[model samples]
Target: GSHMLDHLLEMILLVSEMEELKANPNRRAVGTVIEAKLDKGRGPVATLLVQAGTLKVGDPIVVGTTYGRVRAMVNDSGRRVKEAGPSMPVEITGLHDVPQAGDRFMVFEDEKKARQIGEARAQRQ
Candidate 1:
């Protein structure tokens, strides 16, 4: 139990650190997902790697043209995570729109809220 707890804590800390890192423009990197594949049976899913700064669950990512918050983050081993750094391979679910591998991925916050705002702005267009 202790080991499991330690792992969980480590994940939390890693995520927190990732958040800080991403916010620092000098330390952060950015890129786009060049391609992605999804599982039809599962909910919205994607296989992606950090194109830029590190990413984490709850990091609020903008995928493609739509701004969607990062809902769930996981690694190849099925380990859930709060964040990830550059070149790290991971999968994510709950995007507002499917992201292409070459689409730009940027961190933001609150997908639902962001979508609401985006929709309102789109109405003006």
Candidate 2:
């Protein structure tokens, strides 16, 4: 898991320079979960690096198979921004439950799709 972080970093950096990235922000925030755990003070949190679009507070995101809303985000630079763009790493709050490393993540504009995906995943168990 640790080694993959650097690898993904390199990957994001390269991809960020591509036309896919140059196209500007993604329609919605999306990325992968690199780290996940419970913070005694913060409750649930996940460390994710944005691969496309911008992640912001109040956005619904799917992490791993777990879906939830984003409460806040602090970029890799340690500054709290309204949103994070492609290739930026950030510690974010709001995972319905703990997620596993390498979990694919994506945000949605509407609550229905996000809720459906997450609820469906939960139900499969």
Candidate 3:
């Protein structure tokens, strides 16, 4: 009897959570990184596919254990861009090291926090 009641409550809770996600309005630049490369000239470049918000040049970002300010962005068509919005694919350069593929990335308002998180995660590795 108790288990059945708990299951019913859980289902209702999931439905309410679904509605909350549907109405979410925060647009922080967050995405999954497709690849990270070390170019002889550019150093660390990462291919990012944005899922929410806008990622812009000069934004401090952290990916896995790497962090950097977005010094430059390039779209798939080979042109430089100031920002990448939801569902857009772009490449960014400036990370201190190459992050692994499938690493998630997000923008941070504070550069110090970003760097700290990056270094802390790196140390754990």
Candidate 4:
């Protein structure tokens, strides 16, 4: 029982570390949001360019559509990130709305805050 518990703890720690690494923009696909497409009837999407780091599935990202928090991330990848940096095209989905091109994106912890900011932005427009 003790050994099993230890293993579980270790797994939890590893998962936590992975999450931290995921949140690090330095490890993400370095790039900028080029476009945000919001189909009120469909969903939200963002077109991004990978400028530095590698983009991967399940990586949380935030752009103008979402604030500091990650509104959505790519879950499927037909390609892999093999030491890619700059000028790569990637699309992200699951946003509350589309974001504008040329907007910087980051990882966030508060989804509610991100949604609020996104809504406010829409209202202003």
Candidate 5:
């Protein structure tokens, strides 16, 4: 009885957590990387679909073990913009290595924390 009740409560809280993500659009931006590729000229480029907030130019993002600064962003129609909003599809340029498909991305206010988390996760590999 207790175990089943715990599972149901977890799901309910998960929904509440998702709704709270909208509290901070700029600071809470999240994107799911749909695909990635390596270009000889530009290094690694990843196409991501935004789900929350605004992902801006110069934002530091971490995708699994890969971390990079958003040096440039291009929309689906092939134009550059300063930031990407919810439901927008955009391509980002600046990763040192192409992250695997389906990797979730999020903006980090501190690169050091990102680098540390990345390093710890890197060791888990």
Candidate 6:
């Protein structure tokens, strides 16, 4: 768990271009997966680097072929936060399953649409 936080900063710099992480206020946020793992209490935890917008708790989101409503989010400092903005690294626990690294994620206001998209993507995979 600690290792996850430790490597986040270095990994962010390595994988991303400077322009991609610029702060941009957005009504709907999109991000990329840095890593993902299953924890004892948290069913599936995803490490996300918000690229284009802000992410908030309770927002239904889909990444790769996995989808779920955001239950909780923790910042890089291991502190919980209600929202994460562009260029922020946050660990979110809510995905139905672990998402693959490099997968892009998008938010949806509705779970039904998120579920449909997730199902469609799974079929495609």
lDDT against the true structure, per candidate, is 0.54, 0.59, 0.58, 0.44, 0.59, 0.60
Error of 3 at 75 (Å): 0.8
> Given candidate 6, what's the lDDT at residue 117?
49
Error of 3 at 91 (Å): 0.3
Lowest lDDT sum, 10 consecutive residues, model 4, at: 5-14
- The sequence of per-residue lDDT tens digits that candidate 4 reaches over residues 1-125 is 11111111111001122222232365442347777677665356666775433343444555644633223443225343322223456666555655778876643221222223563222544
Candidate 1 Cα errors over 4 Å, as ranges: 1-29, 108-125
> Which ranges in model 2 have alpha carbons more than 4 Å from their true place?
1-30, 108-125
Candidate 6 lDDT over residue span 1-125, tens digit each: 11222222211111112223233333233567798878778768888886654566775667776778778889888888866655678878878777777777765222222224463222544
Question: Any runs in candidate 6 off by more than 4 Å, and if so which?
Answer: 1-29, 108-125
Task: Indicate which candidate wins on lDDT.
Answer: 6
lDDT tens digits, residue span 1-125, model 5 = 11122211111001112222443343354557788887788668888876644456776666666778777888878889866565678888777767666777765332233224453222544
Give the Cα-based TM-score of candidate 4 against the true structure.
0.42
**Model 5: how far is 3 from its true place, Å?**
44
What does candidate 2's lDDT look like per residue over 29-125, in tens digits?
Answer: 4567688889888768888886655566766676867777777788888887665656678878877588666666774332232224563222544
Question: Could you tell me every candidate's TM-score relative to the true structure?
Answer: 0.53, 0.59, 0.60, 0.42, 0.60, 0.59
Q: Give one digit per residue, the lDDT tens place, for model 3 in 1-125.
A: 11122111111001111111111234243567888787888768888775533466776676866678777899777789875555678888888777667877765332233224453222544
Clashing pairs in 4: 30-51, 34-101, 36-99, 51-86, 68-108
When summed lDDT is taken over every stretch of 10 residues in candidate 1, the lowest stretch is 1-10
Clashing residue pairs for model 6: none
Q: For model 6, how big is the CA root-mean-square deviation? A: 14.9
C-alpha positional error of residue 109 in candidate 6 after TM-score superposition, expressed in Å? 7.2
TM-score of 5: 0.60
Model 4: CA > 4 A from native: 1-30, 40-42, 65-86, 107-125
